[PDB]
Design a protein around this nucleic acid. Structure first.
Lengths: 262, 151, 141
RNA sequence: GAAGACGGUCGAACUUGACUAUCUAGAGGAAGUA
RNA sequence: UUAAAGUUGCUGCAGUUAAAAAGCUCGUAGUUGGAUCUCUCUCGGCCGAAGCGUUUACUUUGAAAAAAUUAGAGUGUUCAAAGCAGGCCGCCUGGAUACCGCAGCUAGGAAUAAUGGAAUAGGACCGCGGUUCUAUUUUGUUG
RNA sequence: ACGGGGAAUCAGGGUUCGAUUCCGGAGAGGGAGCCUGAGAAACGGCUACCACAUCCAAGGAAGGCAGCAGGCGCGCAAAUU
RNA sequence: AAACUGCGAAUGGCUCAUUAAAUCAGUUAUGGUUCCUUUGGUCGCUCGUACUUGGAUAACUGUGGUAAUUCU
């Protein structure tokens, strides 16, 4: 190419958007924004493919252009605006609030939350620097910078934002015994307790996580998001509790849902 | 003499060396303070690095390089260039049809700091990846272990 | 016997790819001299101008005259004798005709009785010989 | 502040050679081909 | 063009007479090579941080590996090739999973196969000694 | 010979194909040089030379389908201005 | 409407000629770089006519040239 690309073919779109083959050649191609385009939901896919409020992209244009969608407390008229992990999508007209949280199969769930919960979110601090007359700074996982954080906040911690002010209320430290969600790789969407972290210098660290049923899995350090302190999550968790069932017991649950219902 | 062999004055760029002083230190002990650093992967800086007098801008311990990337190791074959040697890395390549292997090798021109004096051929160097130092040089000698017979 | 050791992969495959050239099928289809001698140039069919009708005499343990056609190809100007299959099919062929020529079946070798003929006629004046033989079409005027 | 000019650089192309290759006009002939 | 072709042979061919073994010995690379040897230190909370143990190959694990395609789960496109949908009387449920050689990462194993270590002792483990430079704690403060 | 993902065949091992809708590269007749711009050595931008080629009142002016159609050619071989 | 200004025209589409450690694939790195846009930060931090500054130029009007152009 002679410059940056603007299209996305539909087959090369991310798998967890769950687009299908035959409706078009192109995928929505997210705008640049706070989240990575392999790691986001564009607002057009959330609003007609997940919520079924629209049937075309033209109707998503009509819904968004009435200024009806607030993502993290601000109105977005962009239909390909990249919403991402733990963003609060709040539709005021229908009185719904949503948070984007991965399912146990690594896709964003349609997780409804109460408007008490819709005033905060958790972020993961990715960078700390001191800049220009000794003012300390944060950089979170969704491109927020915060001036003057608490000096105990370090890289890989998890802070809590109030969505109106933008300021930190409190935070969790990165330690063994805290609760996780995996935000990357094979183990994506799983939830458990930190038990170990082995440090390889010059390369990626590996964190071992233990499930609520005693299953254990590793990730890398960058695929780790500290949800809660100890065992209590600071947010509401989706339908499955981050416990990935095997295919045999998922089949057993799906068959037990048919011999009882009907 | 003994450093200044080139047409330009060789000096460590981080150390200021014309600090004026009174005659009780101007005549007493004359020592240029040496710049050195600690590269980070468990490698310890040699003794000849922190007390020597050589000036090499490409040395991993007293120069301006960083070591990041791949740690490898080879065996010294040629020591014939200025401050850079040629190592040989032997490996086995699996051919799948025959379920078997063939001996291949690759050469690497690698930069050798003057803090590793008494480096023979036939002995094992550990090399670390740095930024491109030349047209064909990308690695840097970090640790020398002798051959099997040199007691 | 052959080497068998765990590090003999270079000796094994460089011997096989050098003994592969002693096979007739590999040497034919991987050297390039046989493709430059093939008048079709690797094509399945070709087209030429009929220069003259030619009677070729059958080989010894039987006796007849096979009704061939000397045809000069369009795309490279090479000349070719080609066999006209059924009876009274040489009557359908004028001279200076467009003709479509196929292979004769054995991939460049002469099929049994006819000596040194690798080709056969399929169309004449853009009408197939089978349509003329079974009386489905006629030669255009 | 335009035209223009000295110089430098990048540099397609042009000419004359040498070597090499191909397409075409080309006397003569030979052998085999039948 | 693939199988048939064990007529290219790694699995897996052949070399007296059918095609075929070098005139003879030496000899570099390559290939192949006889037995043999049964885990701890300071701190942080009896365990972790600090070392690894000679070094690899091997093996098992883990994570990382685009989708589509292939294998494969569900689902009566009227069946099927397909598709990713659909199912009850506003609800309910999907959109799984496997494989992805080699090279490179991680963790266990230690048989097999290489390599190392004390034979002019410049050997280990110990206390004792001497030479040179130095941490900065030490003198209500300051020099 | 554009490279991969892949394709056909297949007891097991293999052998052959991959120009071709996904990803990566390259090139817009042949070479070369540039302007603008965040990004181009861009060709549905410009300036030359080389090869072709258009309009002319003979002074001059304009060009680039390996985009969609379509035509000629080439061929064994491929669709609607 | 026009025209000035701003942005886009470097994406897409086509083809496979070149190209054999090159392209490309997996893996790593930029602590050796640049980055329109998006998103967040920053924008009385500087001790020295303003209750608003200056000259133009299109569109338009009018006179034209050339056999001829998205010429002027």
């Amino acid at each position: 190419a002679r410059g940056p690309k603007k299209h996305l073919k539909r087959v090369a779109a991310p798998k967890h958007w769950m687009l299908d083959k035959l409706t078009g050649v192109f995928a929505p191609r997210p705008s640049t924004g706070p989240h990575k385009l392999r790691e986001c939901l564009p607002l057009i896919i959330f609003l007609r493919n997940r919520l079924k409020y629209a049937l075309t992209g033209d109707e998503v244009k009509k819904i968004c252009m009435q200024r009806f969608i607030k993502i993290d407390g601000k109105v977005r008229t962009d239909i390909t605006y990249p919403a991402g992990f733990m963003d609060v999508i709040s539709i005021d007209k229908t009185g719904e609030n949503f948070r984007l949280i991965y399912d146990t199969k690594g896709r964003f769930a349609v997780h409804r939350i109460t408007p008490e919960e819709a005033k905060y979110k958790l972020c993961k601090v990715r960078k700390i620097f001191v800049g220009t007359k000794g003012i300390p700074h944060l950089v979170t996982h969704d491109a927020r910078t915060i001036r003057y954080p608490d000096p105990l906040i370090k890289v890989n911690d998890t802070i809590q934002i109030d969505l109106e002010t933008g300021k930190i209320t409190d935070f969790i430290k990165f330690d063994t015994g805290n609760l996780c969600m995996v935000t990357g790789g094979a183990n994506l969407g799983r939830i458990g307790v930190i038990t170990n972290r082995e440090r390889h210098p010059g390369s990626f660290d590996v964190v071992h996580v233990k499930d609520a049923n005693g299953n254990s899995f590793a990730t890398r350090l960058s695929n780790i998001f500290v949800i809660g302190k100890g065992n209590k999550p600071w947010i509401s968790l989706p339908r499955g509790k981050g416990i990935r069932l095997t295919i045999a017991e998922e089949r057993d649950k799906r068959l037990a849902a048919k011999q009882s219902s009907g | 003499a003994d450093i200044q062999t080139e047409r330009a004055y060789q000096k460590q760029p981080t150390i200021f060396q014309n600090k004026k002083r009174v005659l009780l230190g101007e005549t007493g002990k004359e020592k240029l303070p040496r710049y050195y650093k600690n590269i980070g992967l468990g490698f310890k800086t040699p003794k000849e690095a922190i007390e020597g007098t050589y000036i090499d801008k490409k040395c991993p311990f007293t120069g301006n390089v960083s070591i990041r990337g791949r740690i490898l190791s080879g065996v010294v074959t040629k020591m014939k260039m200025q401050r850079t040697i040629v190592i040989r890395r032997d490996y086995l390549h699996y051919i799948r049809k025959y379920n078997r292997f063939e001996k291949r090798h690759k050469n690497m021109s690698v930069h050798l700091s003057p803090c590793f004096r008494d480096v023979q051929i036939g002995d094992i160097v550990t090399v670390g990846e740095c930024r491109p130092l030349s047209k064909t040089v990308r690695f840097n000698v970090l640790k020398v272990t002798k051959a099997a017979g040199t007691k | 016997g052959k080497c068998r050791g765990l590090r003999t992969a270079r000796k094994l495959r460089s011997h096989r790819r050098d003994q592969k050239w002693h096979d007739k099928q590999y040497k034919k289809a991987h050297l390039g001299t046989a493709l430059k001698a093939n008048p079709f140039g690797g094509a399945s069919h070709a087209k030429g101008i009929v220069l003259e009708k030619v009677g070729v005499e059958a080989k010894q343990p039987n006796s007849a005259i096979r009704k061939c056609v000397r045809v000069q190809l369009i795309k490279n100007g090479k000349k070719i004798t080609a066999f006209v299959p059924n009876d009274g099919c040489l009557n359908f062929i004028e001279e200076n005709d467009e003709v479509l020529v196929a292979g004769f079946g054995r991939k460049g070798h002469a099929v049994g009785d006819i000596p040194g003929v690798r080709f056969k006629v399929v169309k004449v004046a853009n009408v197939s010989l089978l349509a003329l033989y079974k009386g489905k079409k006629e030669r255009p005027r």
